[PDB]
Design a protein around this ligand. Structure first.
Ligand code: NGQ
Ligand code: ZN
Length: 450
């Protein structure tokens, strides 16, 4: 099939009159700027690579916004976590799948074309494994296929309630596997995921939830083709607790004990000191920044300017899914730096003064890297994942090139995303997803049950 864009953001920058040929398998086959649109579908606005969403816990969308109730003069991440545990305790396999499908449809409508699902809900309500332990992982994959979103499934190793290998709490029972069972699950997922065109990654929940021996064991197991994700340094309390346990800060500890490299996505990484920031940038690991969730949970502000300055790589994730908006994450990534520094125009490159373009470029690259997928760029051989902005919008129609990204990301919003393609298939057209009516009906029923 062929599509034609009057304006498109290609790897070398903005281009005009671009004709794309897309293979039967949804791969970009030919990309020709300054071309004719003969026989190709003319697109309705500016075309961008789709944005990868590098961190998600799907089920949390069901509780999104409901935890905004003061139950203490000092509510925090940790009282929130108890509420999250209460919901996860009652979620059936069918409910989990319905929530995921609905969530992925909403992600697509926002311009997220692929998602890394950081998946730790493994077992039944009693904490016992399903007859096929991959039961819930397979439902995540089925939901992603139904929505049409790209997927890297990250089954999560979760074994302990805290540093020093503390025993898992009852509230964590659905998450728990030892290293051996985890590795069996991981290996068993390869075939079904491959069959769906989906990807896989290794994942440790956090340094609180696994032991150093488990990390070594898993990393030595031979899955060298896989991304590696971990929540790290999100909350000050984890930093303090890590120091009491090891005499090291979380990021410090990880870098001293593990060969962190480009395979890694360090989710949050919020409390990184100057040395830790330097080590992250040197390693080529991706910082998985979840701005709306980090603000919602009162985590803090990442040192993004220092990090970017040293060649740091980053991407964005919607995480708890209080927000499903590429615009909001990138906008408030920048705005948080502005509020901290009390200055403007914080995240730019030496070769790129445009803030919107800097942010979009960065998150596309970090997102693709963290997912381990051939995405993030409209280049021959990469997957045809793209969004089409509103060509009739007066702000966008009046802008060219990087100014258009500034109008969208800093003055515009989600409804400016009109059409979305993943793997060469249109999954959103004029703001609508074909499965939205059925999904919303299933979803409202599930919310009522919960
Ligand atoms: N940290 C965030 N935001 N989310 C975590 C909460 C549980 C924890 O970290 O122990 C999670 O969904 O696993
Ligand atoms: Zn998370």
């Amino acid at each position: 099939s062929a599509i034609f864009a009057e304006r498109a953001l290609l790897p070398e920058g903005w281009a005009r009159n671009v004709r794309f040929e897309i293979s039967a398998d949804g791969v970009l086959a030919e990309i020709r700027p300054d071309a004719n649109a003969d026989g190709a579908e003319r697109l309705g606005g500016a075309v961008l690579p789709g944005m990868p969403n590098l961190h998600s816990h799907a089920f949390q969308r069901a509780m999104a916004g409901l935890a905004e109730v003061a139950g203490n003069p000092n509510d925090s991440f940790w009282t929130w976590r108890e509420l999250m545990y209460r919901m996860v305790a009652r979620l059936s396999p069918e409910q989990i799948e319905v929530i995921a499908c609905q969530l992925y449809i909403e992600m697509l409508k926002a311009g997220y074309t692929a998602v890394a699902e950081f998946h730790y809900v493994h077992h039944d309500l009693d904490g016992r494994s399903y007859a096929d332990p991959a039961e819930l992982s397979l439902r995540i994959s089925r939901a992603a296929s139904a929505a049409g979103i790209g997927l890297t499934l990250l089954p999560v190793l979760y074994s302990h309630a805290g540093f020093g290998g503390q025993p898992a709490s009852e509230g964590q029972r659905r998450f728990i596997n030892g290293s051996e069972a985890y590795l069996e699950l991981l290996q068993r997922l390869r075939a079904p995921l491959e069959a769906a065109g989906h990807s896989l990654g290794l994942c440790f929940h956090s340094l609180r939830a696994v032991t150093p021996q488990q990390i070594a064991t898993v990393l030595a197991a031979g899955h060298d083709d896989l991304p590696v994700h971990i929540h790290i340094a999100e909350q000050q309390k984890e930093v303090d607790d890590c120091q009491a346990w090891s005499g090291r800060r979380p990021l410090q500890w990880l870098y001293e004990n593990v060969a962190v490299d480009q395979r890694w996505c360090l989710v949050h990484a919020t409390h990184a000191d100057p040395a830790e920031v330097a080590a992250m940038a040197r390693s080529g690991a991706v910082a998985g920044l979840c701005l709306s969730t980090e603000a919602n949970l009162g985590d803090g502000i990442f040192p993004a300017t220092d990090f970017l300055a040293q060649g740091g790589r980053l991407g964005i994730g919607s995480d708890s899914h209080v927000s499903l908006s590429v615009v909001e994450e990138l906008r408030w990534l920048e705005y948080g730096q502005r509020l901290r520094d009390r200055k403007r125009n914080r995240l730019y490159r030496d070769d790129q003064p445009m803030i919107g373009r800097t942010l979009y470029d960065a998150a596309l690259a970090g997102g693709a890297q963290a997912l381990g997928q051939p995405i993030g760029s409209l280049a021959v051989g990469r997957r045809a994942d793209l969004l089409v902005l509103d060509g009739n919008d007066p702000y966008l129609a009046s802008a060219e090139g990087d100014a258009l990204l500034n109008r969208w990301l800093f003055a515009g919003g989600d409804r400016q995303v009109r059409d979305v393609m993943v793997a060469g298939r249109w999954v959103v057209r004029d703001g609508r997803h074909a499965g939205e009516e059925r999904s919303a009906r299933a979803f409202v029923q599930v919310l009522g049950e919960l």
